[PDB]
């Protein structure tokens, strides 16, 4: 018994039901009445294929919990996940958007840990010294800071 | 890294990005430009926008001869620091009224604690300050000022030297200036404890004086005894962080003294039938929970068993447990806090026996 | 510019509180100088609707409820095999010329059970059991109507009135007893609280007074109790939580005396985490999630995201408990229980992501609204099959669609999208295919949606003006005056004065549209 | 030792909450398996009992109410000459076939006014208006019964029942309107809250629902208001304060939905302020706590202020309404004074307390004996004198049992003589009050003839066990757990003396 996901571009993908129970949405979209195809809008087919490959990898892995706020902080940076999400930034944000829409907490956590490691190790005094979305900052206040820089 | 697409990115995903990015904003530190990032102000705007459920470690300090807000790392390294007019202006930018600001005593010096409290009182507010972090001249200096401290909700007390003087009921001494003033005890909504070994030694751990407790945190304590501890009226929560071997309630000794049945015969009385319906979602894999057989008991006797369970368990909603590594006396919890996700054990492979009483109908 | 949208979405909360919730179900235009007095005292009418029934018909109704409808009454009355003796006692005591108060209480309870039996029976079984003909011989209506033509609801409402008449013969105000409350908890499953909301609020205030007379707070029994006393406390607790659910489903500006002392899940003298979770307090927990969402409708403040995320977490928890309910489907009582819990959990999910769309505009919130709307469409269309059409008769399918098909209409006025139009076509297909037992109420819903459809056209042909500070368009004035008219129709000061007293093309287009499509057509 | 007196005076608070208040007035022994459920719903009864009243008799009732009863209905319906038009409309509309709901509301209001006219009328004019013989032709009782035998109470109860029947024809459940609250507050002037107690509690919960339907929480006139709305909010404030008063006069265990949100045109404000002071006094009956001295001293200072305000009030002799108002206000402030100094005597044992109790008790006796003459005999028919004299004779008898004094004895003889001289419109409550006084006197004789003992820790006497078992029996009788069980399914010589006293002098005789 296989379950067909539908991407945004239209390519229908086919997984198994026990595989698709990694999603916390297939488990509550197929459990209506026992007496098969789930659309996923605004997801490009390559992104949903990568999400399906991630779900096919961790078929028998013990993720910690849903409400364990300290195990998420004491972070396991998994090896295959760190090898997996090594793409450019827009592919990464589309995977994280898809994981939020598919209600998949571990992939969301892994993607946000990768983005957290990116935003943690930014260039000191090169990109941190350039604030760029400048709002609620007057030219007088910006001039005061740049005068206080010397 | 593009911080202009990351800001047009929506709210809760960006929250989940900052959730794993709590203290380590950088990685030794160029603290001039690190404050004026758009990302740090985004962190504090979202953090003010929920309730403060992120880092929340905002201190009042007296640095560079000025009273300013400061955030410290998990290893107590200073990350950012704001003037209060600045933080007010960008909280107003976020909301388009601050009341939750922590106050250490341990991360300060008393010669500047006195000046901090004096200028913070006489300047404008002496308010907008929620937590008070105790754990001895500076302590008594803080106690004299808590009568005017209008909106506080938390007290944390560190190791056993300061605890038994202030929190426990055992004293009833004649020093009004040393202890609380009973108007601060009315709004005392949470209490955390840390860095101690035994809560109940040299007396008894009785919280009956402190009205209005809806939460409680026991963190990094060696040996506690729940049988000794009594609890106030209208008590709600119970959270315990990493502890050593502790004793639980005497519930199983009271079921054993009810049915007049032996220990080994009760070990064949605890069924393990309904373990595959919903407890597989709990992802325990070490503690196989066990219930009582329906055929091996009557109805009214089962209701009396539930009544025995709720005694010494009167008002509690959820019990949260980190790694405790041992529990002596026979965990036997009610299903009304177990069938919903209230009784939450998280990392306990050393615990093995969990008994649950109640109908799963 | 397209920045008029967030203030308008915030205005949707006010419009949803006053038009869809209060003004459609819970508002009755009364005029005390024109209502006929009750000089009949419902004696001839309920005399007919009591001797119309026969014995075999009553036992077939009881067998239908015994094998189907157990998830509704099983918390209220308990097990219905005890009640066959009470039906036998009624048909033996029918010949008696002197009744007691207790016997008339049991008779009112079983007449309420018969009202629920009439409300949840499909048209084929109801035509095979009952006869259309003597009612048209009596009621003087058109003799061409059938049960599917609108006469099942008339018999249901008259059986509810006869249950209330047998309550009137008890002097139920002079003798407080539990068989009032149980009877109302059988009458709160039909559309009786939506027919007469004033009478439902009065009976519910009597039920609150009757419950609080017993002075029971904790339903966990003690160790020094009679076994009968402990079974009494358990049954009283089930009655209490069903009463709290049926109490929140009638709130508004005409229901001032609340029973809501039940503390919601983790923001209050009755903390609802202590009871062993049966069907009834599970239904109450889902209604408590619903009431924690829908208190920010008329309030001016915005809800915190901490609360909405806690609602999401607990929503998934009870979502998984519904999956792990684990009962036998061969008896099909668990099927209807599963449908109730699954439809309520989808409704609460939909309201959560609607407030996510409105108040904070978060990641793909509109897409999640479309997704849960399709889930509600699936859960209703799946019961268009045989043997389970009456599953679409539980009154929560009238509420939720009224929340959905309004909102997806309203958003369609202002934001043009591709998926939203197909979703609105699906809702327009679903709204006509709902069962006809909601009657005029269902008709009113279609009118409201039709008015909103016309409100798209006036948005298109008229250009948005600009004053720099605020925006001006006739749609804004008409949507404002709808709330103004219905808030005027819920002002009882003029009833007080009747009691003890002595008594620009903008404006043109607004008056034309309000003269053509009046909002007061939706008032009951 | 003689240490039982302060704990026994604290026990008097418990006994006065349960026995003199809840047991005698606010407890109805019901049995649902034997009570006839009236299938007729009193149509056969009230059809006759509304055909009995005649038109000119009703206008003489209205004239009597206008002349002598103003200080009652001014809180509810204001002026009664405005109500003459509604009475004319009813007597013209009575011959019709169909009826309207608003008309039946006005009918319920004027029938409640008729009940208030019947309950406070003197016996000579009442005999000149109404006959006696059709009453006994319907009821089948003795022909030799008179109005002083109790037929006036029967006519009052039947008019109250027919007012309720007109409310039942309104479907007042499904049509809330303000005339329900007024027509109940006119029925709250009588002892209708003591005939059918839980029916009165259900009607009062309906009145609270009807009041809170309006959603008016502040009664002050604004500037941009219609003046009709300002007059309506002033009148609604008057109805609200008197409804808080009549709500406080029906509290207990069988009435949990209370209206008391207020804390602590001149007359009604004075009336509610005195009743709210009475509320702040008698909130310590059922409690286990005790009031502070500053609380009782503030109550005494405000008591002296309102005493000067009553001294600042006037009285008119040609206008009997002003004397009626003056007697009601002065008796209320004397009752509040007596309860204050009773709490002084009980709680703190302060000097010059018992003399104040005897002083204000004699003031109460003088205010009643002043009305024993002609032209003002009906002033003793208000329910406040029944409540007050019940509390007074109960506390004086309980004090005479355990403390002997000659002035207290002469006071008890005066109370006992005045108790039998109360009018026969209170009836069964008066007879059970006399029975309770006789039971406490025989309890005094039992205290005299039996030695008090002590085992070294606490005392032992039959009087203590009897007084404790009275509270325990009446707290057992005020439980609805047995009715809930019947609703869900069909499921030594010391002891000899106590059992003989309980077998001879039973406690269940004061119930209803």
Q: Which residues of A touch B90 (CB under 8 A)?
A: 136
D109 part of a folded domain: yes
Please name the chains neighbouring D, where neighbouring means 3+ C-beta pairs under 8 angstroms.
C
Cα D288 to chain centroid, rounded: 25
The reply to whether residue D485 touches residue C232, judged by beta carbons under 8 angstroms, is yes
Query: In DSSP terms, which residues pair with B192 in a beta bridge?
Result: B156, B217
The reply to whether residue D213 touches residue C256, judged by beta carbons under 8 angstroms, is yes
The reply to whether residue A41 touches residue C367, judged by beta carbons under 8 angstroms, is yes
The reply to whether residue B10 touches residue C362, judged by beta carbons under 8 angstroms, is yes
The reply to whether residue D480 touches residue C176, judged by beta carbons under 8 angstroms, is yes
The answer to whether the Cα torsion of C489, C493, C498, C503 is positive or negative is negative
Query: Contact C252/C295 with Cβ under 8 angstroms?
Result: no
Q: What is the resolution of this structure in A?
A: 4.1
Residues D400, D393: Cα–Cα separation, whole Å: 10
Report the 3 state secondary structure along C36-99.
Answer: ECCCCCCHHHHHHHHHCCCHHHHHHHHHHHHHCCHHHHCCCCCCHHHHHHHHHHHHHHCCCCCC
B236 and C CB contact within 8 Å: yes
Residues C417, A7: Cα–Cα separation, whole Å: 19
Query: Contact D448/D404 with Cβ under 8 angstroms?
Result: no
Enumerate residues 93 to 112 of chain C having a beta carbon within 8 A of any beta carbon in chain D.
Answer: 98-105
Tokens of C411: 């958003």
Tokens of B126: 């002496």
The domain boundary residue, chosen from C209, C224, C259:
C259
The domain boundary residue, chosen from C259, C280, C307:
C259
Residues D199, D194: Cα–Cα separation, whole Å: 10
C229 part of a folded domain: yes
Query: Contact D37/C104 with Cβ under 8 angstroms?
Result: yes
Contact partners, residue A5, CB within 8 Å, separation at least 6 = A12, A13, A14, A15, A20, A37, A38, A40, A48, A52
* Size of chain A, expressed as the number of residues it contains: 150
Q: What angle do CA C428, C433, C438 make, to 5 degrees?
A: 105
Cα distances from D2 to residues B217, B352, D458, in angstroms, run: 53, 63, 11
Q: What angle do CA C180, C181, C184 make, to 5 degrees?
A: 90
Residues B246, B250: Cα–Cα separation, whole Å: 13
D173 and C CB contact within 8 Å: yes
Tokens of C213: 């007379």
Q: Catalogue all structural domains in chain A, each as residue range(s) with its CATH number.
A: 1-150 (3.30.710.10)
Query: Contact D109/D77 with Cβ under 8 angstroms?
Result: yes
Cα D430 to chain centroid, rounded: 12
Domain extent, residue D438, equals 1-17+266-451
Query: Contact B51/B98 with Cβ under 8 angstroms?
Result: no
Cα distances from C449 to residues A100, C368, C433, D66, D341, in angstroms, run: 33, 22, 15, 59, 70
The reply to whether residue A97 touches residue C364, judged by beta carbons under 8 angstroms, is yes
DSSP state of D53: -
The reply to whether residue D257 touches residue C257, judged by beta carbons under 8 angstroms, is yes
Cα distances from C18 to residues C11, C299, C358, C484, in angstroms, run: 11, 12, 17, 9
Tokens of A110: 């892994």
C235 and D CB contact within 8 Å: yes
Q: Which H or E run contains D476?
A: helix D462-477
End-to-end CA distance of chain B: 54
Contact partners, residue A19, CB within 8 Å, separation at least 6 = A55, A56, A59
Nearest CA-CA partner of C86 in A141, B4, D487: D487
Residues B239, B214: Cα–Cα separation, whole Å: 11
Nearest CB to C220 within list B306, B335, B361: B306
Nearest CA-CA partner of C205 in C250, C242, C165, C169: C250
Query: Tokens 């388009």 appear where?
Result: B96
Q: How many CB atoms lie within 10 A of CB A72?
A: 19
Q: Is C180 exposed, middle or buried (0-12, 13-18, 19+ CB in 10 A)?
A: buried
Enumerate residues 444 to 503 of chain C having a beta carbon within 8 A of any beta carbon in chain D.
Answer: 492-493, 495-503
Q: Which H or E run contains C481?
A: helix C474-488
Contact partners, residue B293, CB within 8 Å, separation at least 6 = B269, B271, B273
The reply to whether residue D213 touches residue C170, judged by beta carbons under 8 angstroms, is no
The reply to whether residue A101 touches residue C367, judged by beta carbons under 8 angstroms, is yes
Residues D507, C69: Cα–Cα separation, whole Å: 50
Tokens of D310: 């009553």
Query: Tokens 């008029």 appear where?
Result: C4
Closest residue of chain A to B21, computed from CA coordinates:
A116
D320 and D348 belong to one structural domain: yes
Cα distances from D205 to residues C52, C440, D196, in angstroms, run: 36, 33, 14
Residues D398, D417: Cα–Cα separation, whole Å: 17
Nearest CB to C212 within list D228, D256, D488: D256
Helix axes D406-420, D428-449, angle to 10 degrees: 150
The reply to whether residue A41 touches residue C378, judged by beta carbons under 8 angstroms, is no
Query: Tokens 């969301």 appear where?
Result: A108
Query: Domain ranges in chain B?
Result: 5-240, 251-357
Residues D196, D202: Cα–Cα separation, whole Å: 10
Query: Tokens 């108060």 appear where?
Result: C101
Contact partners, residue D322, CB within 8 Å, separation at least 6 = D314, D315, D316
The reply to whether residue B346 touches residue A71, judged by beta carbons under 8 angstroms, is yes
DSSP readout, B22-38? SS-S-----TTTSTT-H
Residues A66, B282: Cα–Cα separation, whole Å: 10
Tokens of B15: 């929250």
DSSP readout, C369-434? HHHHHHHHHHHHHTTSSSS-GGGGGSTHHHHHHHHHHHHHHHHHHH---HHHHHHHHHHHHHHHTS
Contact partners, residue C54, CB within 8 Å, separation at least 6 = none
Residues C518, C306: Cα–Cα separation, whole Å: 40
Find the radius of gyration of the CA atoms of chain A: 21
End-to-end CA distance of chain D: 40
Half-sphere exposure at residue C374, Cβ-oriented, CA atoms within 13 angstroms: 18
The reply to whether residue A145 touches residue B285, judged by beta carbons under 8 angstroms, is no
D1 part of a folded domain: yes
Cα distances from D412 to residues B68, B224, C339, D389, D402, in angstroms, run: 77, 65, 73, 12, 13
Query: Tokens 């008097």 appear where?
Result: D12
Query: Contact D257/C212 with Cβ under 8 angstroms?
Result: yes
Q: How many CB atoms lie within 10 A of CB D476?
A: 11
Tokens of C296: 């920010």
Structure determination technique employed: cryo-EM
Helix axes C396-414, C418-432, angle to 10 degrees: 150
Q: Which H or E run contains A13?
A: strand A12-16
Residues D459, B355: Cα–Cα separation, whole Å: 50
The reply to whether residue C174 touches residue D199, judged by beta carbons under 8 angstroms, is yes
D430 and D464 belong to one structural domain: no
Query: Tokens 């010329």 appear where?
Result: C97
Find the radius of gyration of the CA atoms of chain B: 24
D25 part of a folded domain: no
Query: Contact C187/C115 with Cβ under 8 angstroms?
Result: yes
D171 and D95 belong to one structural domain: yes
The domain boundary residue, chosen from C207, C241, C259:
C259
D121 part of a folded domain: yes
Nearest CA-CA partner of C268 in C276, C277, C260, C256: C260
* Size of chain C, expressed as the number of residues it contains: 524
The reply to whether residue A120 touches residue B283, judged by beta carbons under 8 angstroms, is no
D with B: 3 or more CB pairs under 8 Å? no
C187 part of a folded domain: yes
Tokens of B239: 């959270």
Nearest CB to A125 within list B18, B30, B38: B30
Strand, coil or helix: C8: helix
Report the 3 state secondary structure along B213-269.
Answer: CCCCEECCCCECECCCCECCCCCCEEEECCCCCEECCCHHHHHHHHHCCCHHHHHCC
C234 and B CB contact within 8 Å: yes
D239 and D170 belong to one structural domain: yes
Q: Which residues of A touch B38 (CB under 8 A)?
A: 131-133
- Between β-strands A2-6 and B154-157, what pairing exists: parallel, antiparallel or unpaired? unpaired
Angular region, D421: left φ>0, alpha ψ -120 to 50, beta rest: alpha
Go through chain A and list every residue after which a break occurs, taking a C to next N gap over 2.5 angstroms, comma-separated.
Answer: 35
Contact partners, residue D3, CB within 8 Å, separation at least 6 = none
Residues C108, C168: Cα–Cα separation, whole Å: 10
Query: In DSSP terms, which residues pair with C100 in a beta bridge?
Result: D36
D458 and D443 belong to one structural domain: no
Query: Contact C349/C289 with Cβ under 8 angstroms?
Result: no
Contact partners, residue D271, CB within 8 Å, separation at least 6 = D75, D241, D242, D245, D329, D332
Query: Contact B239/B220 with Cβ under 8 angstroms?
Result: no
Select the residue from D487, D489, D490, D512 to test the C interface by mutation, using most C Cβ atoms within 10 A.
Answer: D487
Residues C427, C410: Cα–Cα separation, whole Å: 13
Q: How many CB atoms lie within 10 A of CB C209?
A: 25
D232 and D83 belong to one structural domain: yes
C331 part of a folded domain: no
D159 and D144 belong to one structural domain: yes
Q: Which residues of C touch D43 (CB under 8 A)?
A: 41
Query: In DSSP terms, which residues pair with B155 in a beta bridge?
Result: B132, B191
Find the radius of gyration of the CA atoms of chain D: 24
* Size of chain D, expressed as the number of residues it contains: 512
Report the 3 state secondary structure along C324-376.
Answer: CCCCCCCCCHHHHHHHHHHHHHHHHHHHHHHHHHHHHCCCCHHHHHHHHHHHH
Report the 3 state secondary structure along D77-94.
Answer: CCCCCCCHHHHHHHHHHC
D45 and D2 belong to one structural domain: no
DSSP readout, D109-169? HHHHHHHHHHHT--HHHHHHHS-SHHHHHHH---TT--IIIIIHHHHHHHHHHHHHHHHHH
The answer to whether the Cα torsion of C47, C49, C54, C60 is positive or negative is negative
Q: Which residues of A touch C323 (CB under 8 A)?
A: 27-28, 31
Q: What angle do CA B226, B227, B230 make, to 5 degrees?
A: 75
Q: What angle do CA D477, D479, D483 make, to 5 degrees?
A: 105
Angular region, B175: left φ>0, alpha ψ -120 to 50, beta rest: beta
D79 and D210 belong to one structural domain: yes
A124 phi and psi angles, rounded to 5 deg? -70, 130
Residues A76, B120: Cα–Cα separation, whole Å: 43
Enumerate residues 86 to 125 of chain B having a beta carbon within 8 A of any beta carbon in chain A.
Answer: 89-90, 93
Tokens of D334: 């004397």
Contact partners, residue B314, CB within 8 Å, separation at least 6 = B231, B235
Query: Tokens 């904003």 appear where?
Result: B25
For chains C and D, what is the number of CB pairs under 8 angstroms? 184
Q: Which residues of D touch C498 (CB under 8 A)?
A: 102
Q: Which residues of A touch C316 (CB under 8 A)?
A: 24, 66
Checking C472-477 for CB contacts under 8 A at 24+ apart, the result is C472/C506, C474/C506, C474/C509, C474/C510, C474/C513, C475/C413, C476/C8, C477/C506, C477/C510
Residues D417, D93: Cα–Cα separation, whole Å: 50
C266 part of a folded domain: no
B346 and A CB contact within 8 Å: yes
C271 and B CB contact within 8 Å: yes
Strand, coil or helix: C263: strand
Tokens of D449: 């003839």
Counting the structural domains of chain C, the total is 2
| C255-288 per-residue burial string, b: 16 or more CB within 10 A, e: under 16 | bbeebeebbbbbeeebbbbbbbbbbbbbbbbbbb
Closest residue of chain C to B316, computed from CA coordinates:
C274
Query: Tokens 């909103």 appear where?
Result: C452
Alpha helices per DSSP H over chain B: 5-8, 11-19, 38-50, 84-95, 110-122, 137-145, 160-166, 251-259, 263-267, 299-310
Query: Tokens 């038109």 appear where?
Result: D55
B4 and A CB contact within 8 Å: yes
- The side-by-side arrangement of strands in the sheet containing B190-193 is B131-133, B154-157, B190-193, B217-218, B237-240, B318-321, B344-345
Half-sphere exposure at residue D83, Cβ-oriented, CA atoms within 13 angstroms: 27
């Amino acid at each position: 018994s296989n379950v067909v996901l539908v991407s945004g571009e239209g390519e229908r993908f086919t997984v198994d039901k026990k595989i698709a129970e990694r999603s916390l949405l297939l488990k509550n979209y197929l459990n209506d009445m026992h007496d098969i195809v789930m659309p996923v809008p605004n997801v490009r087919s390559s992104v949903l294929q990568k999400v399906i490959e991630w779900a096919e990898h961790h078929r028998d892995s013990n993720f910690p919990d849903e409400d364990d706020d300290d195990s998420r902080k004491s972070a396991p940076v998994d090896s295959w996940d760190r090898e997996f999400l090594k793409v450019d930034q827009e592919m990464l944000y589309e995977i994280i958007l898809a994981a939020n829409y598919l209600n998949i907490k571990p992939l969301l956590d892994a993607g946000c840990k990768v983005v957290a490691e990116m935003i943690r190790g930014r260039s000191p005094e090169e990109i941190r010294r350039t604030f760029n979305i400048v709002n609620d900052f007057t030219p007088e206040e910006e001039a005061a800071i740049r005068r206080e820089n010397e | 890294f593009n911080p202009v697409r990351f800001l047009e990115l929506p709210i809760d995903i960006r929250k989940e990005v900052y959730f794993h990015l709590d203290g380590n904003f950088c990685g030794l530190e160029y603290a001039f430009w690190l404050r004026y990032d758009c990302l740090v102000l985004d962190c504090f705007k979202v953090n003010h926008l929920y309730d403060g459920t992120l880092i929340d470690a905002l201190e009042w300090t007296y640095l560079d001869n000025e009273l300013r807000l400061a955030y410290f790392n998990k290893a107590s390294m200073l990350e950012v620091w704001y003037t209060f007019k600045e933080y007010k202006k960008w909280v107003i930018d976020s909301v388009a009224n601050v009341s939750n600001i922590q106050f250490n005593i341990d991360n300060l010096t008393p010669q500047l604690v006195d000046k901090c409290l004096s200028i913070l009182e006489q300047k404008d507010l002496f308010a907008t300050i929620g937590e008070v972090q105790f754990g001895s001249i500076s302590v008594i200096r803080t106690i004299r000022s808590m009568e005017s401290m209008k909106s506080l909700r938390k007290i944390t007390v560190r190791g056993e030297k300061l605890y038994e003087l202030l929190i426990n009921f055992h004293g009833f001494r004649d020093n009004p200036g040393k202890t609380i003033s009973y108007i601060v005890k009315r709004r005392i909504n949470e209490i955390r404890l840390s860095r101690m070994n035994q809560i109940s030694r040299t007396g008894l751990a009785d919280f009956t004086r402190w009205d209005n407790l809806q939460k409680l945190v026991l963190s990094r304590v060696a040996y506690i005894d729940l049988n000794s501890i009594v609890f106030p009226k209208n008590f709600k929560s119970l959270t315990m962080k990493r502890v050593s071997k502790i004793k639980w309630w005497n519930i199983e000794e009271n079921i054993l003294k009810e049915l007049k049945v032996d220990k080994r015969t009760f070990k064949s009385l605890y069924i393990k039938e309904d373990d595959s319906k919903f407890t597989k979602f709990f992802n325990l894999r070490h503690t196989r929970i066990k219930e009582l057989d329906k055929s091996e008991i009557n109805q009214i006797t089962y209701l009396r068993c539930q009544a025995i369970v709720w005694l010494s368990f009167r008002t509690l909603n959820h019990i949260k447990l980190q790694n405790v590594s041992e529990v002596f006396n026979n965990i036997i919890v009610p299903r009304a806090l177990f069938d919903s996700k209230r009784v939450e054990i998280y990392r306990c492979e050393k615990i093995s026996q969990v008994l649950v009483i109640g109908s799963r109908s | 510019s397209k920045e008029y949208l967030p203030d308008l979405l915030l205005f949707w909360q006010n419009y949803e509180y006053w038009i869809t919730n209060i003004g459609l179900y819970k508002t009755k235009q009364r005029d005390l100088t024109r209502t006929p007095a009750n000089l009949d005292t419902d004696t001839e009418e309920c005399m007919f609707w009591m001797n119309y029934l026969q014995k075999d018909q009553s036992f077939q109704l009881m067998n239908f409820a015994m094998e189907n409808l157990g998830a509704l009454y099983f918390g209220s009355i308990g097990d219905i095999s005890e009640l066959y003796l009470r039906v036998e006692q009624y048909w033996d005591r029918r010949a008696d010329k002197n009744h007691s108060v207790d016997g008339k209480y049991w008779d009112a309870l079983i007449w309420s059970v018969f009202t629920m039996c009439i409300y949840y029976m499909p048209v084929e079984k109801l035509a095979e059991i009952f006869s259309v003909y003597p009612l048209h011989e009596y009621l003087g209506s058109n003799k061409r109507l059938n049960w599917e033509d609108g006469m099942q609801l008339v018999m249901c409402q008259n059986f509810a009135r006869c249950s209330l008449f047998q309550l009137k013969q008890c002097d139920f105000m002079a003798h407080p007893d539990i068989r009032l409350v149980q009877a109302y908890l059988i009458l709160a499953t039909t559309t009786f609280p939506y027919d007469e909301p004033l009478l439902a609020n009065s009976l519910l205030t009597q039920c609150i007074h009757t419950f609080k007379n017993f002075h029971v707070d904790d339903f966990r029994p003690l160790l020094n109790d009679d076994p009968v006393e402990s079974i009494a406390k358990v049954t009283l607790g089930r009655i209490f939580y069903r009463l709290c659910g049926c109490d929140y489903l009638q709130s508004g500006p005409r229901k001032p005396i609340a029973l809501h002392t039940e503390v919601s899940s983790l923001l209050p003298n009755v903390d609802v985490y202590r009871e062993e979770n049966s069907t009834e307090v599970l239904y109450w927990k889902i209604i408590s999630l619903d009431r924690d969402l829908d208190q920010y409708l008329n309030k001016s403040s915005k809800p915190p995201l901490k609360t909405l995320d806690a609602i999401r977490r607990e929503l998934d928890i009870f979502q998984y408990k519904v999956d792990s309910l684990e009962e036998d489907f061969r008896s099909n009582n668990s099927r209807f229980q599963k449908f109730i819990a699954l439809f309520q959990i989808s409704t609460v999910s939909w309201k959560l992501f609607k407030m996510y769309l409105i108040y904070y505009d978060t990641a793909d919130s509109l897409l999640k609204v479309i997704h849960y709307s399709k889930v509600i469409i699936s859960l209703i269309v799946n019961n268009f099959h045989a043997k389970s059409e009456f599953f679409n008769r539980h009154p929560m399918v009238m509420q939720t669609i009224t929340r959905v098909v309004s909102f997806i209409s309203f958003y369609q006025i202002f934001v043009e999208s591709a998926a939203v139009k197909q979703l609105l076509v699906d809702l327009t297909e679903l709204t006509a295919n709902l069962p006809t037992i909601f009657g005029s109420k269902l008709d009113k819903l279609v009118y409201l949606t039709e008015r909103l459809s016309k409100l798209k056209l006036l948005w298109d042909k008229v250009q948005l003006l600009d004053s720099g500070d605020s925006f001006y368009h006739p749609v804004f004035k008409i949507l404002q005056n709808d709330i103004k008219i219905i808030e005027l129709k819920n002002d009882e000061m003029f009833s007080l004065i009747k009691g003890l007293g002595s008594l620009s093309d903008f404006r043109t287009i607004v008056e034309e549209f309000q003269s053509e499509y009046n909002i007061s057509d939706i008032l009951s």
